[PDB]
RNA sequence: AAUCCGGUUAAGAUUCCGGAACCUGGAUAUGGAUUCUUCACGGUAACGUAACUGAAUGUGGAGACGUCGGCGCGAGCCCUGGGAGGAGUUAUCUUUUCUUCUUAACAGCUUAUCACCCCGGAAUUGGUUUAUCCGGAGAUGGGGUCUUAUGGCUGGAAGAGG
RNA sequence: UAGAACUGGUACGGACAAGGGGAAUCUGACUGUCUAAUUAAAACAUAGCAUUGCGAUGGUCAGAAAGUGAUGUUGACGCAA
RNA sequence: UUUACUUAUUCAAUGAAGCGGAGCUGGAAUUCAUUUUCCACGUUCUAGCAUUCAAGGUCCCAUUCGGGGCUGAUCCGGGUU
């Protein structure tokens, strides 16, 4: 359902001690009509809902994956 | 001989009234202490159409004196009332169009309507659209009141009985030609199953007493006695005179 | 639909005036003015009886 | 709406607009070009009466 | 002639405080920089002191007499000015245009207004301004 | 234009019903469908619905009245009678 | 009658028409007379009386409805209440108000 | 009171499987918000804000509603242009013929008639509808508020389906 | 939507689709209904006109009775015949 | 005589709510001794409001935080009218 946009809020979500699983989806799109890029989406499963976070930049997602809590069951791709 | 139609209305199976869309009984306010000593005000919030009845109803809402609530009662609208008008019921009510007063407190020649027969039955006489009775006389001896009922047949009632001031709305209603059978259909479909009446002349000797014959005619005389028995009575009941009148009106 | 209202917050079912979610703006406005002026006019109907009935 | 955009464009005033509107609610104008040539005609008459 | 002078009681007829009694503390008839219309800065009360009786205990009197005041800018068309009046020079200097924006100052203003109106509700002058207009 | 010679509204019935009944219906439906003057707001908006009931279009006041017109002549005398009879009590 | 007087007002004085502008002139105290039509609602009637006593301007009732008052002031549209604020040659400030 | 999509069997599917939701009944904690102006602030207003006590009792709304007629706007369909694939016809002709190009319930931001609010003051009467109604009981005009049916965008969700 | 040349062995709403018309008379005004398995009519019905009863401890009618009922969530511009 | 009765029987209404008598003020009333008399006896410019054994006054209780009695709302007869 929900889309949650803040990174700091997303790190609060991943430490909520009832989020058991997460997943990362790698999509491919292109800016305006010009050039392809890699989009990523982080999806954490709540007990009711499912939160996503769209990162259009690779340079922030590369550190953000590193920022995940290691106890989290991550399904990468 | 078959049991005939006019006998058959009395089991009341299909010939009942069609009361679904009717707003309510159009009774007056129950006569209580506030009415027979002082008076009491209501606002008439909405005057609303009724089905089967010609005249409109009126939502007069009074305050219940004895517990904090509102008792909302259904008057027949007098002609000239409007929504938001104050309506004063009671013995000391002023005499304006729509205040309901006892007949003991009105001058003679006052045009009232929805008037009670015996005091405390909440609105019997003069209720169809455009009617009224007129108080022509009083009698402080044994406190009676001499009124003119809308058929002209005058009456003496108790003066503690109550009537509301004015004509009843919907006047000139039967002046329009009900041009076609469909309007009569949609008129009488919200009243009862009276319609369409077949003439007894057309039908058969089981069906009626005017039946039969190799010509459409009545047979014997069509006026039947008052003392004749239920089943024969199909025609002009206990008719003292008949035929078309002559002479001028307003009889002695 | 009428039972949906059971779930939704109170700011969806209310405006913050007096007689908020049940009477509209102007009607509230009118039943101030009426309810003011009447009980001002009614005050005069006591000072009339303090002058007329005293001069009887 | 040709009347409307000529009113909002200031090429006509509100009085001649309100005349022409109820003239166009009756027939008086077969098509858009005919009404434009009628606007020119009455407006040039008002200019010559200025 | 000019009956919106700085002591009149009014009944506010629009806005969240509709049906509550204010006093005008400073009328601006011509208007202002913003608010291009005749507005008056009013001070009114939001919760009314509930009606105490002979039998309420001491502390139960105090909780009954709590007053929650408010300050407001209001247009002239949103007021019923009434014939009543109120000695307002107790807190005349507190409510101003500087009292508004910088909203932290409004709470310090509300404390002054609350003190003054409780000091008039005790020693019960102005009986009409302190009963709830009811409708 | 003016499109009928005499029938007007009752021309919707066409050829039927006779002409005296149709002239009789015309005389009342002109009264019924016309747009009347409001006793309170001073505008010309009182249109009936629901025979006997005359709502104003603005102003929301709702006068009970005649079935085919606002207040028939055998009713507007009655209030004048009341206008007379209320005066005998005092002066 | 009273109508000739209002006509002399309306061509020789200063006035304002209709409720909101009366109350604008009345709270600013430019008011000198107010004329109320008969079919005005009783609430608006009382609200204009009660604003009159704070300015102490006397109220004259126009016997006759708002359409007749709309004609009587020389306009064509209806008017419910008139506020005379500067009278010219006419003298209705001092006649019987 | 409350759900949809995708897949599945020889025969069941809004019911099974996977994903995404919601509603009621009941438990309960943690955060947030309120508080020494003890039961929130803002806006002139229409009203707004993640919240922001409230019994008896009364009132009001939704439930709640005819039929016909045009008018506007949406959805699906129909038609159709460029383009990425596949199939057909080709003695000649035809940048050709057929076909796939899809997106749910639910959630977030945003979007309109109508109605309403503020300023203002209207006759050389002005707006405005296919349809003549509206304005001093305040129109036109400037500027705002709301319903969200509906539509867009993002999530669902491209990892599904084609 | 109108118009113009030009052409067809004068053909062209080319298949489909798709009113016969007029002068009259008897009669019922009409639209509507009915003998479902022989009659759809000039019958019935209807609007319209008129008449009769009746002011509720009432009019007409039902029930074996009853502290029963229909018209009546009615009131003479109404109900009933 | 058809008069007068209410207690039988009969009718009607109300969540059987203020009946009947007496008094209390005013006031029409004229006094033929002093009151012989009858009427009144909280609400009318307004689509607002009216609910918590009732506020007030007065006496208790044992002063807590609260409760109770009378009056405010005249007595009498319990015949719902």
From Swiss-Prot, chain B:
Gene name tied to this protein: RPL2A
Protein family per UniProt: Belongs to the universal ribosomal protein uL2 family.
Cross-link (Glycyl lysine isopeptide (Lys-Gly) (interchain with G-Cter in ubiquitin)) at residue(s): 45, 92, 118, 144
Subunit structure: Component of the large ribosomal subunit (LSU). Mature yeast ribosomes consist of a small (40S) and a large (60S) subunit. The 40S small subunit contains 1 molecule of ribosomal RNA (18S rRNA) and 33 different proteins (encoded by 57 genes). The large 60S subunit contains 3 rRNA molecules (25S, 5.8S and 5S rRNA) and 46 different proteins (encoded by 81 genes).
Key word NAD present: no
Task performed by this protein: Component of the ribosome, a large ribonucleoprotein complex responsible for the synthesis of proteins in the cell. The small ribosomal subunit (SSU) binds messenger RNAs (mRNAs) and translates the encoded message by selecting cognate aminoacyl-transfer RNA (tRNA) molecules. The large subunit (LSU) contains the ribosomal catalytic site termed the peptidyl transferase center (PTC), which catalyzes the formation of peptide bonds, thereby polymerizing the amino acids delivered by tRNAs into a polypeptide chain.
Further remarks about this protein from its record: There are 2 genes for uL2 in yeast.
Keywords, alphabetical: Cytoplasm, Isopeptide bond, Phosphoprotein, Ribonucleoprotein, Ribosomal protein, RNA-binding, rRNA-binding, Ubl conjugation
Key word Phosphoprotein present: yes
Coiled coil stretches, renumbered: none
Entries under SMART domains matching the protein: Ribosomal_L2 (SM01383), Ribosomal_L2_C (SM01382)
Name by which UniProt lists this protein: Large ribosomal subunit protein uL2A
Gene Ontology, cellular component aspect: cytosol; cytosolic large ribosomal subunit
UniProtKB/Swiss-Prot annotation, chain C:
Subcellular location: Cytoplasm
Superkingdom of the organism of origin: Eukaryota
Annotated function: Component of the ribosome, a large ribonucleoprotein complex responsible for the synthesis of proteins in the cell. The small ribosomal subunit (SSU) binds messenger RNAs (mRNAs) and translates the encoded message by selecting cognate aminoacyl-transfer RNA (tRNA) molecules. The large subunit (LSU) contains the ribosomal catalytic site termed the peptidyl transferase center (PTC), which catalyzes the formation of peptide bonds, thereby polymerizing the amino acids delivered by tRNAs into a polypeptide chain.
Subunit structure: Component of the large ribosomal subunit (LSU). Mature yeast ribosomes consist of a small (40S) and a large (60S) subunit. The 40S small subunit contains 1 molecule of ribosomal RNA (18S rRNA) and 33 different proteins (encoded by 57 genes). The large 60S subunit contains 3 rRNA molecules (25S, 5.8S and 5S rRNA) and 46 different proteins (encoded by 81 genes).
Note: Present with 23600 molecules/cell in log phase SD medium. There are 2 genes for eL34 in yeast.
Similarity comment text for this entry: Belongs to the eukaryotic ribosomal protein eL34 family.
Protein name: Large ribosomal subunit protein eL34A
Swiss-Prot record, chain E:
Sorted UniProt keywords: Cytoplasm, Ribonucleoprotein, Ribosomal protein
Pfam family, one: Ribosomal_L27e
Ribonucleoprotein found in the keyword field: yes
UniProt key word Ribosomal protein: yes
Domain of life: Eukaryota
GO CC terms of this entry: cytosol; cytosolic large ribosomal subunit
Location in or out of the cell: Cytoplasm
Disulfide bonds: none
MF annotations from Gene Ontology: structural constituent of ribosome
Biological process according to GO: cytoplasmic translation
Subunit structure: Component of the large ribosomal subunit (LSU). Mature yeast ribosomes consist of a small (40S) and a large (60S) subunit. The 40S small subunit contains 1 molecule of ribosomal RNA (18S rRNA) and 33 different proteins (encoded by 57 genes). The large 60S subunit contains 3 rRNA molecules (25S, 5.8S and 5S rRNA) and 46 different proteins (encoded by 81 genes).
Note: Present with 7380 molecules/cell in log phase SD medium.
Biological role stated in the UniProt entry: Component of the ribosome, a large ribonucleoprotein complex responsible for the synthesis of proteins in the cell. The small ribosomal subunit (SSU) binds messenger RNAs (mRNAs) and translates the encoded message by selecting cognate aminoacyl-transfer RNA (tRNA) molecules. The large subunit (LSU) contains the ribosomal catalytic site termed the peptidyl transferase center (PTC), which catalyzes the formation of peptide bonds, thereby polymerizing the amino acids delivered by tRNAs into a polypeptide chain.
Family according to the record: Belongs to the eukaryotic ribosomal protein eL27 family.
Name used for this protein in its record: Large ribosomal subunit protein eL27A
UniProtKB/Swiss-Prot annotation, chain F:
Gene Ontology BP terms: cytoplasmic translation
GO cellular component: cytosol; cytosolic large ribosomal subunit
Predominant location: cytoplasm
UniProtKB keywords: Cytoplasm, Metal-binding, Phosphoprotein, Ribonucleoprotein, Ribosomal protein, Zinc, Zinc-finger
Modified residues (Phosphoserine): 39
One example GO MF annotation: zinc ion binding
Residue spans, zinc finger C4-type: 38-59
Protein localization: Cytoplasm
Pfam families assigned to the protein according to its UniProt record, in alphabetical order: Ribosomal_L37ae
SUPFAM superfamilies hit by this protein: Zn-binding ribosomal proteins
Presence of the UniProt keyword Ribosomal protein in the record: yes
Oligomer status and interactors: Component of the large ribosomal subunit (LSU). Mature yeast ribosomes consist of a small (40S) and a large (60S) subunit. The 40S small subunit contains 1 molecule of ribosomal RNA (18S rRNA) and 33 different proteins (encoded by 57 genes). The large 60S subunit contains 3 rRNA molecules (25S, 5.8S and 5S rRNA) and 46 different proteins (encoded by 81 genes).
Similarity comment text for this entry: Belongs to the eukaryotic ribosomal protein eL43 family.
Described purpose of this protein according to its UniProt entry: Component of the ribosome, a large ribonucleoprotein complex responsible for the synthesis of proteins in the cell. The small ribosomal subunit (SSU) binds messenger RNAs (mRNAs) and translates the encoded message by selecting cognate aminoacyl-transfer RNA (tRNA) molecules. The large subunit (LSU) contains the ribosomal catalytic site termed the peptidyl transferase center (PTC), which catalyzes the formation of peptide bonds, thereby polymerizing the amino acids delivered by tRNAs into a polypeptide chain.
Record protein name field: Large ribosomal subunit protein eL43A
């Amino acid at each position: 359902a929900r889309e949650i946009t803040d990174i700091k809020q997303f790190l609060e979500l991943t430490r909520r001690a009832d989020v058991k699983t997460a997943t990362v989806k790698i999509n491919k799109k292109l800016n305006k009509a010009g050039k392809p890029f890699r989009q990523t989406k982080f999806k954490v499963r709540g007990s009711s809902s499912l939160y996503t976070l769209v990162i259009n930049d690779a340079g922030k997602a590369k550190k953000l994956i590193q920022s995940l809590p290691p106890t989290l069951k991550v399904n990468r791709l | 001989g078959r049991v005939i139609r006019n006998q058959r209305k009395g089991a009341g199976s299909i010939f009942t009234s069609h009361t679904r869309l009717r707003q309510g009984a159009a009774k007056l306010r129950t006569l209580d202490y506030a009415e027979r000593h002082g008076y009491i005000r209501g606002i008439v919030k909405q005057i609303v159409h009724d089905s089967g009845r010609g005249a409109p109803l009126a939502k007069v809402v009074f305050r219940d004196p004895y517990k904090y609530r509102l008792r909302e009662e259904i008057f027949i609208a007098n002609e000239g009332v409007h929504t938001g008008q104050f309506i004063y019921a009671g013995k000391k009510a002023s005499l304006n169009v729509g205040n309901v007063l006892p007949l003991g407190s009105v001058p003679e020649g006052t045009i009232v309507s929805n008037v009670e027969e015996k005091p405390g039955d909440r609105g019997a006489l003069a209720r169809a659209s455009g009617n009224y009775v007129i108080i022509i006389g009083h009698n402080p001896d044994e406190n009676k009141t001499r009124v003119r009922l809308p058929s002209g047949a005058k009456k003496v009632i108790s003066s503690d009985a109550r009537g509301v001031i004015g004509v009843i709305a919907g006047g000139g209603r039967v002046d329009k030609p009900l041009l076609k059978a469909g309007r009569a259909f949609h008129k009488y479909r919200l009243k009862r199953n009276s319609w369409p009446k077949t003439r007894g002349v057309a039908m058969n000797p089981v069906d009626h007493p005017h039946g039969g014959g190799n010509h459409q005619h009545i047979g014997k005389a069509s006026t039947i006695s008052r003392g004749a028995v239920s089943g024969q009575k199909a025609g002009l009941i206990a008719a003292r005179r008949t035929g078309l009148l002559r002479g001028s009106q307003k009889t002695q | 639909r009428p039972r949906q209202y059971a779930t939704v917050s109170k700011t969806h079912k209310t405006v913050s005036r007096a007689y908020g979610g049940s009477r509209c703006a102007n009607c509230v406005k009118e039943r101030i003015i009426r309810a003011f002026l009447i009980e001002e006019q009614k005050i005069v109907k006591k000072v009339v009886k303090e002058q007329t009935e005293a001069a009887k | 709406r040709l009347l409307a955009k000529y009113r909002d464009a200031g090429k006509i005033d509100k009085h001649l607009y309100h005349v022409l509107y109820k003239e166009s609610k009756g027939n008086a104008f077969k098509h858009k070009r005919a009404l434009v040539e009628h606007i020119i005609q009455a407006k040039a008459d008002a200019q010559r009466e200025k | 002639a000019k009956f919106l002078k700085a002591g009149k009681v009014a009944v506010v007829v629009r806005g969240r405080y509709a049906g509550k009694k204010v006093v005008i503390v400073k009328p601006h008839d011509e208007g202002s920089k913003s608010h291009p219309f005749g507005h008056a800065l009013v001070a009114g009360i939001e919760r009314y002191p509930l009606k105490v009786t002979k039998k309420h205990g001491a502390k139960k009197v105090a909780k009954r007499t709590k007053i929650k005041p408010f300050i407001k800018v209001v247009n002239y068309n949103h007021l019923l000015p009434t014939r009543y009046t109120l000695d307002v020079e107790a807190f005349k200097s507190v409510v101003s245009t500087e009292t508004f924006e910088q909203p932290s100052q409004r709470e310090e203003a509300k404390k002054v207004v609350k003190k003054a109106f409780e000091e008039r509700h005790q020693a019960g002058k102005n009986q009409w301004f302190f009963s709830k207009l009811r409708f | 234009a003016k499109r009928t010679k005499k029938v007007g509204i009752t021309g919707k019935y066409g050829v039927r019903y006779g002409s005296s009944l149709r002239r009789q219906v015309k005389k009342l439906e002109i009264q019924q469908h016309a747009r009347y003057d409001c006793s309170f707001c001073g505008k010309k908006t009182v249109k009936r619905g629901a025979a006997g009931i005359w709502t104003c279009s603005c102003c929301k006041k709702t006068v009970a009245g005649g079935a085919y017109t606002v207040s028939t002549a055998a009713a507007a005398t009655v209030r004048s009678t009341i206008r007379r009879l209320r005066e005998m009590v005092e002066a | 009658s009273i109508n000739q007087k209002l006509a002399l007002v309306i061509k020789s004085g200063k006035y304002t028409l209709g409720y909101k502008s009366t109350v604008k002139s009345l709270r600013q105290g430019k008011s000198k007379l107010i004329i109320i039509a008969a079919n005005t609602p009783v609430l608006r009637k009382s609200e204009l009386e009660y604003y009159a006593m704070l300015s102490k301007t006397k109220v004259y009732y126009f016997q006759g409805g708002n359409n007749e008052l709309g004609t009587a002031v020389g306009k064509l549209f209806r008017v419910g209440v008139v506020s005379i604020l500067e009278a010219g040659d006419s003298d209705i400030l001092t006649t019987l108000a």
